[PDB]
């Protein structure tokens, strides 16, 4: 049997190694009966031609999976979203391997779109777990005003509710805020001394400058952040001792390409060897009804425990995520980043490297200051 797989990539080297990874999957896992072929579509600037080309060549070729990476410019995150929309037009199960924006987290819209890497919101799951290491019952939460912010805030509050350790107060601010010293002032007046921050690059720079402005960067006010703010240019303004995150080998794209190819090939074979599966949708033009097998192959992908992953144990969660990730906490030490704690998916165990806390603190301090 012949089944086609799309891949929207303008990186030619990754095009060749994607085809090579498809061939590796076919030779290793066994593609005796079903012949999986791979096609590639270049990244254009505008997304109207993504839609045009995707149903002119990919949906016309009746492809099952389209392997799309993050957009080349991380400002128009929209570009993969028309791809997911076209996937949901005829219910085409599509894998995006590098995306972690929360816009696709809502399965009410992008039910046909699956990410091989955790979203930024999953980073919140670390912090609570991180908090569990240090018993910091008092925390201040900072968050922007965007779908990522709503998702992160909801996830963190729901996860913190169950253990009776409650977030003292969460402050939500509009992105691009010209000044935030007032908000961090009412954060400072709070009894808590542990700060959680999650925002974009410019927002991170502004809040870091505000913290440095009024002595909040000193001792006691422990800072704990993620990965967005440990990029860009915020540490041009951020102080030292900032505790960010680092998800495991997600920046790499070739290994994730090979992993996604293996998962897709395994699931496609295991499913097409079972049922009277309908043929893939015939194209942009002339198709009146949608491909309704999509939810069934979605269930297969959720149950597709690809334990033979190239990067290790690769399992999909109940929502389309890889759990038990080896998250490494990034302790900033005099403008340098150090791996001070590993996380195998069960506990955040710190390694032997020393951790420098914000404000020049050298040991674990108390997370609150009684009034």
């Amino acid at each position: 049997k012949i089944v086609n797989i799309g891949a929207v990539l303008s990186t030619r080297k990754h095009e060749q190694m994607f085809r090579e990874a498809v061939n590796q999957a076919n030779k290793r896992h066994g593609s005796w009966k079903i012949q999986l072929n791979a096609t590639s579509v270049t990244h254009k600037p505008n997304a109207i031609q993504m839609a045009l080309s995707v149903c002119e060549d990919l949906i016309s070729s009746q492809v099952y999976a389209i392997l799309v990476s993050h957009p080349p410019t991380p400002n128009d995150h929209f570009t993969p979203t028309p791809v997911s929309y076209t996937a949901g037009f005829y219910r085409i199960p599509v894998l995006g391997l590098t995306t972690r924006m929360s816009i696709y987290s809502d399965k009410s819209i992008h039910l046909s779109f699956l990410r091989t890497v955790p979203p930024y919101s999953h980073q919140s799951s670390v912090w609570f777990e991180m908090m569990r290491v240090y018993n910091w019952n008092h925390i201040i939460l900072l968050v922007s005003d965007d779908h990522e912010g709503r998702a992160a805030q909801k996830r963190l509050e729901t996860l913190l509710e169950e253990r009776e350790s409650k977030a003292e107060k969460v402050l939500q601010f509009d992105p691009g805020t010209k000044n935030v010293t007032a908000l961090l002032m009412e954060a400072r007046e709070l009894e808590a001394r542990v700060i959680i921050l999650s925002a974009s690059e410019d927002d991170a720079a502004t809040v870091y400058r505000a913290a440095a402005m009024l002595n909040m960067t000193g001792s006691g006010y422990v800072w704990l952040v993620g990965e967005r703010e440990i990029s860009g240019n915020a540490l041009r303004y951020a102080p030292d001792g900032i505790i960010g995150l680092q998800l495991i080998n997600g920046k790499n794209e070739s290994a994730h390409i090979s992993d996604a190819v293996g998962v897709v090939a395994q699931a496609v074979h295991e499913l097409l060897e079972k049922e009277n599966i309908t043929d893939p949708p015939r194209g942009c033009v002339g198709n009146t009804n949608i491909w309704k097998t999509g939810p069934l192959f979605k269930r297969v992908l959720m149950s597709s425990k690809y334990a033979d992953g190239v990067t290790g144990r690769v399992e999909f969660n109940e929502d389309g995520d890889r759990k038990f990730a080896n998250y490494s906490i990034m302790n900033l030490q005099n403008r340098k980043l150090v791996q001070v704690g590993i996380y195998n998916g069960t506990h955040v165990i710190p390694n032997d490297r020393k951790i420098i806390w914000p404000g020049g603190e050298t040991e674990k301090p108390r997370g609150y200051q009684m009034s």
Epitope: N75, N233, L235, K251, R335, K336, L337
Partner: nanobody
């Protein structure tokens, strides 16, 4: 390890749009850091001709705002500084480098391209 290499036209003609070429090799450094461009005069003074992230955040001396541009394409791992306002006395040597985050260090420099104008 990783390295940077340079090139350019070398010969100059009136009313031109100079393109100064730098590529990164050794590893796929195309979605991190902040790639930087500077000039250097025969008087040994330097000043940044540009810094560009992997998102499109270009910044440099406001003297030549319209004249200087950055054209980065990641398929070739290639980036050009598009320079203008080049008179006969603007002969210099320009460099491409990387901005590792945290302002840790301006370590991996480019070997430099000697742009001659006459």
């Amino acid at each position: 390890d990783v390295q940077l290499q340079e090139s350019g036209p070398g010969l100059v003609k009136p009313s031109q749009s100079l393109s100064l070429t730098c590529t990164v090799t050794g590893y796929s450094i195309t979605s991190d850091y902040a790639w930087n461009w500077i000039r250097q005069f025969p008087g040994n003074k330097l000043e940044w001709m540009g810094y560009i992230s992997y998102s499109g955040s270009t910044g440099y001396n406001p003297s030549l705002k319209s004249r200087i541009s950055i054209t980065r394409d990641t398929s070739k791992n290639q980036f050009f500084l598009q320079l203008n306002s080049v008179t006969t006395e603007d002969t210099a040597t320009y460099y491409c480098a990387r901005l590792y985050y945290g302002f840790y260090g301006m370590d991996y420099w480019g070997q430099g391209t000697s742009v001659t104008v006459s």
